[PDB]
Each structure stands twice: as structure tokens, then as C-alpha cells.
Amino acid sequence: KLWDSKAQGEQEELHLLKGSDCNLTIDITEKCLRLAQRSAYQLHTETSATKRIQKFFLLGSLNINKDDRVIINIDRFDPGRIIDRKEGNKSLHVPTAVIPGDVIIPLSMQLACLGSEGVSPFSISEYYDAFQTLTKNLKLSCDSVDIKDMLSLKIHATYYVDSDEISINVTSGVVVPSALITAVPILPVSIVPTALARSLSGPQDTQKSGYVAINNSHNLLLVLDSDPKLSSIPLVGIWVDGVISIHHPYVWSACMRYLYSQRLTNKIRDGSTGFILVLYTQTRPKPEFWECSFSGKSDKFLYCQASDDIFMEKVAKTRNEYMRLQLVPN
């Protein structure tokens, strides 16, 4: 045995939305929706044979509240640019300017023909391809763990304009990995007191994470997520700093990242054997140790949509009105 796996506390079940009661909240500022409708109507009037389906992007920020409540605050519309790689004749549709920290939400909107009770948001023809691309990015990324790389959200909006007001039915849908991480508190393991370990047990509310290596003396060495030795060094887990508890969604995101990464080719401890998590919480001077395991289906995902009507005055009252959407999964 590489270390002692005896449980020192209650088991915990990890998932992205566990702390948030499986609920994902979306707040969209009525101003950015109004800009989206304006652009859609211009497009819809610039050509007459093309059916009215506009292609835009919305831009948001990811925020996590007092009680681990995940909220996406979408407040910027960006019509986007078209670029041509010349691989295929069809031109490509891309956001205007991808900002680091921006949640990119593809926005499709169309004027409803007569009446559409059935709502199909984030259809499989486009959402499915987008989510395949998303998980492909999640498998190969070398960057720090980012909660934004863990979900793919799209919005379909059906709108109508009359002389008095603009009315819009907004259906917003998201997909995300379903994997639950089983976590068991375990007894502390000796860590080589390197400079990283000393700075880690020391004192900003910025999350950071890394990976866990082992040396000849069977002592644990903490490693940065940017260390080039990671490609073949034997890895047994991760370290995470800067959260209040294990229920913070950043922890589930880091666990998923460790399990999925194919840049780490020497993961001698994984989900079947159990791997180590060194958690440097903000409420304790020393880290907590957990053994994590997973045994279910690897490529299964959670998804859902929400929809609501909104009625807007033609004149944008100088308010900060917004629309709140929740998560109602299948």
C-alpha cells in the first residue's frame, strides 16, 4: 500500500452542482437581450428569402455566491466575426473577441412562424457538436483548472415585435459532465517540505491547483500544473488551495480534469485505485486529505433547459432589469 486509506470521516459525494442543489442560475441583463433582438431584427430585414434565424454570441461571467450557489451573469452581446480558414468553402462564425474569463454562450434566435409550444433548445445538431468540442478541449487542455471549461450553454430565443412592445420566449440550455466523485477523509501523509509546500501551508480568494508526485523516499512532492515533467512523472493525485469546503465546484472540476487528462501519461493512481486530494482550506491552517474514487459511466452527462417569456417596452427604461433562469434537468 502506497498510503493508508482508512476512512477518518464521513464520505462525501461530489458533483458540479451538488452544493447548489443541482440548480444552475442564469441572470441575463434585459439590456443585452434588447441589443440581441435589435441585431436580429436588422438581420431579419436585410434579406427576404433567408428565413429569420440570427446567429450571435452572449458574453457572461461565472460567479459563486455565499453558499456555493453557481450563477452565470450574462451582460454583453457580441454579434461576432466571420473568418475563413479556406479548408472548406463555407465561412465560419466566431465570437467577436474572446476575453479570458468570458463565458461564451452561442445565441440563436428566430421569429416564430405561428406558434411553437415545443421548445428544442441547444439542439443536438449544433449543441451536440459543440459539446463534443467542449469535452475534447477538456481532455487535452494544459491550462489551470477553469470552471468555465466544464459546461456548454446555448440559448434559443423566439421574438416578436409590434408597435407597442417586444416579446421574447427565451429557452436556455446547458450540458455538463455527470460524473460523481466519491471522497473519503484519510489520515495525513508526509509531504516533502519544498518551497511550494511551504508557501501552500502558509497564508486572496484565488483558486489554484496542481498534481501530486512521489520521490524515492516515498515522500509526497507537490507539483505545479505547468511543470513539464508532468508528461511522464508518476502522478497519484492533486492539490487544491483556496476553497472553504470540499463542496466548492472547483474541487469537482479539478478531479474531473485529473481523471480526463491524457497529457499525464503516468497516472499510476486513478479513479479505480483511488487518488489523493490535498485540500488547503481557508478555515484551517493545515490541509485536509481525501481519497477520491469513481466507478460509474465515463461519458455520461447531465443537461437541461429553462424557458420563460419576457415583455419589454420599446423604450429601454433606465433600470437594471434582468431575467433569471434556473436549471430543470430531465
Numbering used by the authors: 13 to 215, 222 to 348
Which lines from the publication concern this structure?
Here we demonstrate that CEP85 is essential for faithful centriole duplication through a direct interaction with the previously uncharacterised N-terminal domain of STIL, a key factor involved in the early steps of centriole formation. Subsequently, through its C-terminal PB3, PLK4 interacts with STIL and phosphorylates it, enabling STIL to recruit SASS6 to the site of procentriole assembly.
Subsequently, we also determined the structure of the complex between Trichoplax adhaerens STIL-NTD and human CEP85 cc4 by X-ray crystallography to a resolution of 4.6 Å. The structure of the complex was solved by MAD using crystals of the corresponding selenomethionine derivative. The structure of the CEP85-STIL complex shows a 2:2 binding ratio with one STIL NTD bound to each of the two coiled-coil strands of the parallel CEP85 cc4 dimer. Compared with the unbound CEP85 coiled-coil structure we did not observe any density for the N-terminal half of the coiled-coil, probably due to its partial unfolding in the crystal. The interaction between the CEP85 coiled-coil and STIL NTD involves mainly subdomain 1 of STIL, in particular the region of the β-barrel capping helix and the crossover hairpin-loop that, together, constitute one of the two conserved patches in the STIL NTD. Each of the STIL NTDs interacts with both CEP85 coiled-coil helices. The crossover hairpin-loop of subdomain 1 of STIL NTD contacts towards the N-terminal part of one of the coiled-coil helices, whereas its barrel capping helix contacts towards the C-terminal end of the other CEP85 coiled-coil helix. Due to the relatively low resolution of the complex structure we could not resolve any sidechains. However, several conserved residues of the CEP85 coiled-coil and STIL subdomain 1 would be well placed to make electrostatic and hydrophobic interactions with each other. The structure of the complex between STIL NTD and CEP85 cc4 indicated that the highly conserved residues L47 and R50 in Trichoplax adhaerens STIL (L64 and R67 in human STIL, L60 and R63 in Gallus gallus STIL) and human CEP85 Q640 and E644 are located at their interaction interface.
